[PDB]
Amino acid sequence: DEIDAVGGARFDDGAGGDNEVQRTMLELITQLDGFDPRGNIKVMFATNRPNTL
Amino acid sequence: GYDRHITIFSPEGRLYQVEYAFKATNQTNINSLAVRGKDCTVVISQKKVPDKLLDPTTVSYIFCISRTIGMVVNGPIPDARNAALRAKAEAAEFRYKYGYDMPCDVLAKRMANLSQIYTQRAYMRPLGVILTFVSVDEELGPSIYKTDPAGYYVGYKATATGPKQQEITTNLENHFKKSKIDHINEESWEKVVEFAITHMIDALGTEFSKNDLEVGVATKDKFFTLSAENIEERLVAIAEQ
């Protein structure tokens, strides 16, 4: 549910970087295709903005 | 969020947009060293030519803007030709409306104003080039004026440009301290070409062959560029020094 949090598009900014938000997002991505077949797991995303994704 | 994206001021009083131009100038890696002789001005510069397939005659960074005014360009070559075109054009116009050939002093201030306006627009990109205008004037003698993307300029006893120019500035400064005379002296222009080439070989810690040099000298009532054939006769003249 609601991945406006943890879904921000990756950018470089020189303040600190978007590192904490994207750390979580990139973990996710790799386990939605594996480097091996994933099991029976259907995933529902629900968002208010598909533009922050 | 928009203060470093058009040429308006920042909370600091600085213009970062204007500043980025100064960080674009030194990305071409082309050095220049320019000294005022006794009755000439000599400017020597590198001519990097990367690939085999470039025709080397065409690669240049010495532009003839008048009979008396040459202009030596450090920074990207698109910005170079647009500053060069605007210069030739203004030189013609001056001749037209005032009846004598344009003196350098005036071209220096004229390209400066155009630089100034370019940082007080919002739709004009400041040209990122440092141009050095070398001349021999009949009222103010041999001069060097260096303009820059902001719109400041000052005269020079000598000046250098490029990313290794901190080094070149050091050699020339020592030279004019020790001697205690503001300009280099030697009567013949040919030999100011020799002194000038030594100071680039010492400073950069590199030797130069004929295709790596491209030399412009403004003497009296004429600007020429030395052919690469004639530049070797100078490279030999350093072997007897």
Partner: protein, 249 residues
């Protein structure tokens, strides 16, 4: 093309005009300059500054003549001064030397260059100029007068003031040393003394550009024999002449 017809000076939300505020930061970054108003002259003063010693100071200018009776000296950005000096000479001829045939009074010319200021605190595609000028002069009915034209576009008449990075310390020195009779020669001793405490680099008659708006010199007139006209009142001091008055501290 041009589509920039919207002002980039806009009201800030707790009040004030943000660009003009910022631009005044850029004034206080630059060199230090001062002016002292006597009873028979005004002196103006500035320090030269270069990239290296390889620059010449001889061809450099920072004090300019706008009319022979009215000079200017700035503290702030070099580029902005350079164009704004030229626009000042231009409006001074075009709007009083073609209309009333002569150079304009100091009050009037000041008022025109504040309106040049004003039309880059406004209009599209422009930011404020980043200088503050002293425009000192002499007219025939308001006497010697010193003004400060600023990035806001206001003017203030002054009797002695300073602008630039050492402005805060300079004016306190000048508040306590001011007096209601000064001669122009006595004015000079104040201005040099103050400008010596704001320099920490080298001090010479070649690195302090000093100008007087004294009294009339017919040796700069260029000609003799019309007694109706009286030569440049403006007179920039050569390096040799300044150096004696430096020793005189």
């Amino acid at each position: 093309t041009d589509r920039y017809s919207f002002s980039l000076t806009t009201f800030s939300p707790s009040g004030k005009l943000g660009q003009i505020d910022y631009a005044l930061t850029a004034v206080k970054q630059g060199v230090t300059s001062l002016g002292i108003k006597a009873t028979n002259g005004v002196v103006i003063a500035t320090e030269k500054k270069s990239s290296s010693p390889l620059a010449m100071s001889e061809t450099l200018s920072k004090v300019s003549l706008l009319t022979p009776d009215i000079g200017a000296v700035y503290s702030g950005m070099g580029p902005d001064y350079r164009v704004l000096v030229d626009k000042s000479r231009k409006v001074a001829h075009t709007s009083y030397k073609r209309i009333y045939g002569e150079y304009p009074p100091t009050k009037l010319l000041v008022s025109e260059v504040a309106k040049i200021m004003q039309e880059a605190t406004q209009s599209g595609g422009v930011r404020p100029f980043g200088v503050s000028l002293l425009i000192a002069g002499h007219d025939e009915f308001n006497g010697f007068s010193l003004y400060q034209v600023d990035p806001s576009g206001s003017y203030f008449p002054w009797k002695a003031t300073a602008i630039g990075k050492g402005s805060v310390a300079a004016k306190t020195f000048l508040e306590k040393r001011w007096n209601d009779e000064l001669e122009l020669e006595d004015a000079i001793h104040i201005a040099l003394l103050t400008l010596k405490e704001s320099v920490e680099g080298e001090f010479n008659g070649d690195t302090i550009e000093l100008a007087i708006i004294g009294d009339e010199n017919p040796d700069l007139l260029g000609y003799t024999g019309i007694p109706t006209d009286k030569g440049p009142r403006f007179r920039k001091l050569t390096s040799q002449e300044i150096n004696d008055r430096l020793e005189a501290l």
